[PDB]
């Protein structure tokens, strides 16, 4: 479970902190939201695939930032992450991802598949309880929101997914990306 | 300076200079005159097209090459060395645009081009390139960016240069009357005047302008 | 693969001296079309010079001839035909002539930059008419340089034909008149020339038959 | 779902903007129509295969356009795209495509399979609701159409596919061959 | 040639070290609370875009270095250094020690001074960085492949003069305005305010950044 | 070895052509009736089995050729020729055109006259082929890699003498018995020779009979 | 890679002259244990001789030093550590020193027998405890030869320390007395010292205060 | 190494043939009744196990040969010959023709006389077998790569003296006891020679045990 | 890799001069024993002669010694042990000595025929007794030649020991009389009764200076 909400101000990400293999919870504290400089990603699936994609993308963001004299745009890092997912189609990184950042073009939110398909959308959820959470988002999303009101919408939608999905549960972190503060 | 050390290319002279690299720079001094100017309003680079035989396609021959829709460049010296180097440049540019879906910084284009020149000036059974390049583009968020590739592999970013047979004469003319606060009709005039100190329709001219971020030919 | 103090590669200029010692080959490109031909000198009176070949057909639209050595331009003709048919297998399209001469000339460059490889001692004069715009004709130098030409000739009598075509060039001409001009630029007998022409009306290339080039070569 | 209609004046393409994995809609806005150069393509299937084919074909269209000094024809780009699909037969690009453009020979519309078979037709549909949508096209079509009347035929046929296929719906993009107007 | 003289010295290595003696003057100083290294940018032609030419390169967030000698040899060596650094950060998710960066750089230099048909590098490097806590660290790469960690050195045309000036007044105590001042006084055309390139790493926030063009003017005016 | 002289001639190729001038005399004649090619078998020692020495080699049942110069260079070149011929017949199930056989042979000679640490071949070949439903064509391979198709040539120590004899009395139309007579006369002798002929009626290439070799030698 | 008519390889002997121009390094073995140390001469006032390193720790029980060039014996130290840790991954056992010096010396041989490869210009002296067979010292020559020594020293003053250790090398020494002997053989803190002791089978390099007080003794 | 002299001769090949002239004397004789080849075993030091040192090598159960010149060049060439023979017998389950064994041996010699950084072989071989049908068979390999089939030859230090003795009186057929007599006479004590024979009745070659050699000394 | 006009390779003879400058090594073969030994000169007083190795054990049944350089014959000893254990892994059988010296000598040939490779400057003498007959001794020359010997010795004093063993040889000796003979010509021995190659420990050498 992971939720992104696009506001006119900035993109808000939030996801669970629960990992269960089979019918048994191994950990009540498994980080599924990660920071990349100005950007931030969060996904669901196998944890090891998600962790190595945060680390690979962190390295190659530093790759682009050290060579060219311009800081990375979110569309460029998204197409990069789509190609990284796409080269390994034979053995796919089993993880659906949400990519969120703010560029000079504006706030941008992105959906990535293990094959590597890039989708732009305003609001999205990913994982087991995503069905439930998008229901809450489909009830109460408007294009004109504030950053902290979208925080409360993400808490309401994630709390609904906690109460009605067996694979999700307690432990919520929220990443508020306006341009000034990460 | 001791000049018995001209064997192969992978050998330092006792002063420390590689003589074959300097000999390759003599090969671009024997090339045709090519010019590149950048001011503030955009980009002009051009090249002389001398007619050695009355039965030559002066208007059919090509020396201005378009690396991407936003970067063009010209070469002087040999043709084939800078031409296989132009194939590597276009391939690297389209590879960067396939990965990031983004125009390419010119420091990175000239970087990987110049790194190829270094790799052929450090291995035994490979002749160095006898071609110098001058690269002009404006797809960056700032303003224009001109670079020049030397067969040693060095960068020099320039406001305006020219290399070839009449390269030093145009170099001293552009030393006389250059200035930044100037526009695009006047900078293409300046490059034509810098080639005149050294003709009906026997010159290739290409310009990139900062308003619509693209590169075109004439 | 050593650079001289002035900057010239001496082995390349020596290979260009080797094509100066070749037979005389001609290529003319007018407003009318493309004609290229080659002299067939007979060193021995038992040669099958009627069976020897110097005009090669790269594709049904483009042909070319070589001068200098035989074997170097012959393996270079195999690479050209392979590159042309590879482009036609991919795109199902005729090939632009700048790209054929490009990859040929890039091969010449690659053998003029590596140590234990002799450069090519053969110059080529390609010329096709598949483009929908106008005809084309280029020449490959062993340095790897292009020069597009209206009309040239290289070999032993290359400079004499070069100055003759400098004298009486007509840009607009007849295809019967441009094959006339190349025969005049070479000066032979029945069995001392191969002639091939490409015409813009039906976009194809063909070398001439023994009782067709002869009936036109009588006229002079 | 994606529909191409061949008119005397040009070629009209239109497709869905809906992606659903399983029984669940992930996105109400997934572009399945793309404009490359002087023409456009649009297909259905896995989105990542279609997106990487738009990007690969965009690069090699620029490849042909730079190195051969002329612009590119639609039969040539179709044969190129058929070979690109065909070299990867072991791991096929899981996507059926519609290729549409206008050459000097006239308007040309093309159907491509994941193996790489090239078909030239007048009217076509591709995907889940293609059965439904081609039904509408097989009713009202004529060889003598106008460009904007064929737009309305594509809206009627795609709307039928919206009501009767559980894979398409929401909005539908349109490229006429170039204007693009989303209604 | 990769052949040993009867004394035992390799002549091409000493000739390559003469090639870096013909390089521009680059400076590196390492004192008790951080890192400053800078490089002269001499203007051979009026038409040079001097304030856009680059000689300070950023290997990692905490490691910056400069080269002298040739450009292209130390530049392809800078790409290998950045690749090794980012590979170590992908494996361990950790900043890289400079002894290991300069190790693999120097091992590449050694490998090109022992094989036949390969010219050695004609570039010397000076590498600085904050590592991980502790204090700063500075190394210099010689084309033979040797390490020498230094408190403060400078190599190039005026390398020996800057070596003797820093031999004179090397104050132990480091400041945030005195460690950049010492390098500015160890460089010696009068000095331009937009024709010299300065980068510093400081121990409080463990990072490295080149000075902006406004910061060059404000610092070079106190001299 | 891979360096041009200032006139443009490769000296090592001409030195290899001097090595085939020091070879034994081999002959090849083509006429309307077909193909005759033969080779002298000089006896340097009385210990030599001249009956056992081979110089006429059969590439395919319709293609035969001989070499002069060194033995081993043209012999490894004969193995490559036989392999290329049988590969074409495995692919197309068809006899092979001689322009393509001599093509790939000659391309191998070129490839060893353009690379550094390889000596060029010091062997010239003369190949006789009837192809399929066509008049027989004879081609000669030079160590530079050049083709020259010939009506009749001979190379070796007495190559120029046979060349001028065939310049005297050679024409286009005559028998198989008269062209084997013509080649024997061009080699100037009781029995030291290998003779092979290809005839156009039954499109095949054969070898020594030692019956018709004595009988036709007496004329 | 060519033999002189006497049979000696001249390039190998030239590399042994290169280690004769190296700094003085010392290795001594007594029944008390292992001591090896190396001189650290200061060519410039600005050299961080406090941070320069010549004693390297191969494993917890094997340390060695080099003389001659730095980079050749340093890439040779990476190969030694890789071979040691590979043996410890396979057998889960400490490594015999004859096998470490074997594979090091075999690499030196392989670079003294192939054409386009320069030989190593570095001599090594390796000390450790291995098993329990009292001490174990070897020396690697650039020809690839072993010589196991009780105590040697090579470098500029190598022959003087060799003749000093020829004078007063004694079997019944303390570990404190054998580190005394190496300091006496080198004739305040520009020397770095490392010892391996047989009681606790490990290697230790001396810290600043340790070698400082031991120098102030004798 | 790989350069033609202006006459056309390769000097390094002729120098390698001078190296086999400095070899020990080896002999091979071939009569209409069978095959005998032997080799001299000179004793340079009084501590050699001359009864254990080997120069006659067995390639197959029906083909074998001796070398002269260097030892190691013809010895690695003997391993290649045995490998090629056993490879042909694994494929066809048939004894190997000797023209094919000497072919592939001689082609290897050619390949080392055409490439730059390779020294040519300094060993000449003489090969004797029986195969099936061609009872008297003998070939000689020259370091240029040439075949010469011989009735009887000998090469080494006294090679020309044995060559002229074998040039003397000798007819086509005679018993194997008389052809081994001829080879012993062509070499001019009991174990200074080592001798191997192949006989046409049982198509093999056992070697002589030293007991039969002692029977062939005194007679 | 170039022939002189007589036909001799000069670099091979120069490598044989390098083994003439080696230490003296000895090998003697009788009809009842193998003994081979090697001199251990002490150049410096700090060198532990009793710690330096020159007798190497190829297999359970085969030992050999080298002279000339150390490192060339030492990497050649690793190839010899590797080839022996590979033959013993395949056939589960002791290795014939003609095959060990064969492949060793073929390696020497391969380094005397290729351009950018120096030849070996080491001669080997190999003594094995695992055959069903009697013992077998061979010597490898850097040209790649075999010579099987009853008894030889090569090094600086190689010719003096060569002429001494020419003086007083015998076919039938003890283990004890043939090790006496090798000591007089100036240690490891293989004996035919128990088919193994034993190395003497540090005590037994004190017998032989006394006896």
Automatic annotation (TrEMBL), chain A:
SUPFAM superfamilies tied to this protein: N-terminal nucleophile aminohydrolases (Ntn hydrolases) (SSF56235)
Modulation of this protein's activity: The formation of the proteasomal ATPase PAN-20S proteasome complex, via the docking of the C-termini of PAN into the intersubunit pockets in the alpha-rings, triggers opening of the gate for substrate entry. Interconversion between the open-gate and close-gate conformations leads to a dynamic regulation of the 20S proteasome proteolysis activity.
An annotated GO BP: proteasomal protein catabolic process
Pfam families attached to this UniProt entry: Proteasome
Enzyme Commission code(s) on record: 3.4.25.1
Secretion signal, residue range per the UniProt entry: none
Entry GO CC: cytoplasm; proteasome core complex, beta-subunit complex
Name this protein carries in UniProt: Proteasome subunit beta
Gene that this polypeptide is encoded by: psmB
UniProtKB/TrEMBL annotation, chain C:
Cell location: Cytoplasm
Domain Proteasome alpha-type subunits: 1-18
Entry's Gene Ontology BP terms: proteasomal protein catabolic process; ubiquitin-dependent protein catabolic process
PROSITE patterns from the UniProt entry: PROTEASOME_ALPHA_1 (PS00388), PROTEASOME_ALPHA_2 (PS51475)
Any one GO molecular-function label of the UniProt entry: threonine-type endopeptidase activity
Known role: Component of the proteasome core, a large protease complex with broad specificity involved in protein degradation.
Quaternary data: The 20S proteasome core is composed of 14 alpha and 14 beta subunits that assemble into four stacked heptameric rings, resulting in a barrel-shaped structure. The two inner rings, each composed of seven catalytic beta subunits, are sandwiched by two outer rings, each composed of seven alpha subunits. The catalytic chamber with the active sites is on the inside of the barrel. Has a gated structure, the ends of the cylinder being occluded by the N-termini of the alpha-subunits. Is capped at one or both ends by the proteasome regulatory ATPase, PAN.
PANTHER family with a match to the protein in the record: PROTEASOME SUBUNIT ALPHA/BETA (PTHR11599)
Protein name: Proteasome subunit alpha
Name of the gene encoding the protein in the UniProt record: psmA
UniProtKB/TrEMBL annotation, chain D:
Entry keyword Signal: no
Subcellular location as annotated: Cytoplasm
Keywords for this protein: Autocatalytic cleavage, Cytoplasm, Hydrolase, Protease, Proteasome, Threonine protease, Zymogen
Protein name as it appears in the record: Proteasome subunit beta
Subunit and interaction comment: The 20S proteasome core is composed of 14 alpha and 14 beta subunits that assemble into four stacked heptameric rings, resulting in a barrel-shaped structure. The two inner rings, each composed of seven catalytic beta subunits, are sandwiched by two outer rings, each composed of seven alpha subunits. The catalytic chamber with the active sites is on the inside of the barrel. Has a gated structure, the ends of the cylinder being occluded by the N-termini of the alpha-subunits. Is capped at one or both ends by the proteasome regulatory ATPase, PAN.
Enzyme class: hydrolase
Family that this chain belongs to: Belongs to the peptidase T1B family.
Top-rank taxon, per record: Archaea
Function summary: Component of the proteasome core, a large protease complex with broad specificity involved in protein degradation.
Regulation: The formation of the proteasomal ATPase PAN-20S proteasome complex, via the docking of the C-termini of PAN into the intersubunit pockets in the alpha-rings, triggers opening of the gate for substrate entry. Interconversion between the open-gate and close-gate conformations leads to a dynamic regulation of the 20S proteasome proteolysis activity.
GO terms under cellular component: cytoplasm; proteasome core complex, beta-subunit complex
Organism of derivation: Sulfolobus acidocaldarius
InterPro entries in alphabetical order: Ntn_hydrolases_N (IPR029055), Pept_T1A_Psome_bsu_arc (IPR019983), Pept_T1A_subB (IPR000243), Proteasome_sua/b (IPR001353), Proteasome_suB-type (IPR023333)
GO molecular function: threonine-type endopeptidase activity
Reactions mediated catalytically: Cleavage of peptide bonds with very broad specificity
Keyword hit for Glycosyltransferase: no
SUPFAM superfamilies to which the protein is assigned, alphabetical: N-terminal nucleophile aminohydrolases (Ntn hydrolases) (SSF56235)
One GO-annotated biological process of the protein: proteasomal protein catabolic process
Alphabetized HAMAP family for the sequence: Proteasome_B_A (MF_02113_A)
E.C. code: 3.4.25.1
């Amino acid at each position: 479970t992971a939720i992104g909400i696009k506001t006119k101000d900035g993109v808000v990400l939030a996801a669970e902190r629960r990992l269960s293999y089979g019918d048994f919870v191994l950990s009540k504290s498994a980080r599924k939201v990660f920071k990349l400089g100005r950007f931030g990603i969060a996904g669901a699936g196998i944890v090891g695939d998600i962790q190595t994609l945060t680390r690979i993308m962190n390295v190659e963001i530093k790759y682009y930032e050290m060579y060219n004299s311009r800081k990375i745009s979110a569309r460029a890092a998204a197409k990069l992450l789509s190609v990284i997912l796409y080269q390994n189609k034979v053995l796919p990184y089993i993880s659906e991802l949400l990519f969120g950042g703010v560029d000079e073009d504006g706030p941008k939110l992105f959906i990535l598949d293990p094959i590597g398909s890039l989708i732009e959308d305003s609001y999205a959820a990913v994982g087991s309880g995503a069905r439930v959470a998008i229901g809450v988002l489909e009830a109460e999303y408007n294009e004109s929101l504030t950053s902290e009101a979208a925080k409360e919408l993400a808490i309401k939608s994630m709390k609904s997914a906690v109460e009605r999905d067996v694979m999700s549960g307690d432990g919520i972190d929220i990443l508020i990306i306006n341009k000034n503060n990460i | 300076a001791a000049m018995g050390y001209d064997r192969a290319i992978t050998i330092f002279s006792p002063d420390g200079s590689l003589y074959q690299v300097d000999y390759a720079f003599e090969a671009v001094k024997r090339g045709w005159t090519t010019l590149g100017v950048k001011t503030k309003s955009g980009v002009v680079l051009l090249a002389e097209k001398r007619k050695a035989t009355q039965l030559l396609d002066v208007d059919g021959i090509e020396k201005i090459f378009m690396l991407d829709d936003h970067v063009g460049c010209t070469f002087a010296g040999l043709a084939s060395d800078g031409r296989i180097l132009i194939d590597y440049a276009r391939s690297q540019a389209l590879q960067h645009r396939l990965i990031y879906d983004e125009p390419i910084s010119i420091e990175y284009l000239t970087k990987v081009i110049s790194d190829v020149k270094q790799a052929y000036t450090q291995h035994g059974g490979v002749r160095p390139f006898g071609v110098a390049l001058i690269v002009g583009g404006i797809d960056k968020g700032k303003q224009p960016k001109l670079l020049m590739t030397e067969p040693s592999g060095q960068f020099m970013p320039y406001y305006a240069v020219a290399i070839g047979q009449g390269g030093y004469t145009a170099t001293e003319y552009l030393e006389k009357n250059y200035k930044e606060d100037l526009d695009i009709q006047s900078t293409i005039l300046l490059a034509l005047r810098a080639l005149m100190a050294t003709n009906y329709s026997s010159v290739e001219i290409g310009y990139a302008d900062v308003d619509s971020g693209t590169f075109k030919k004439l």
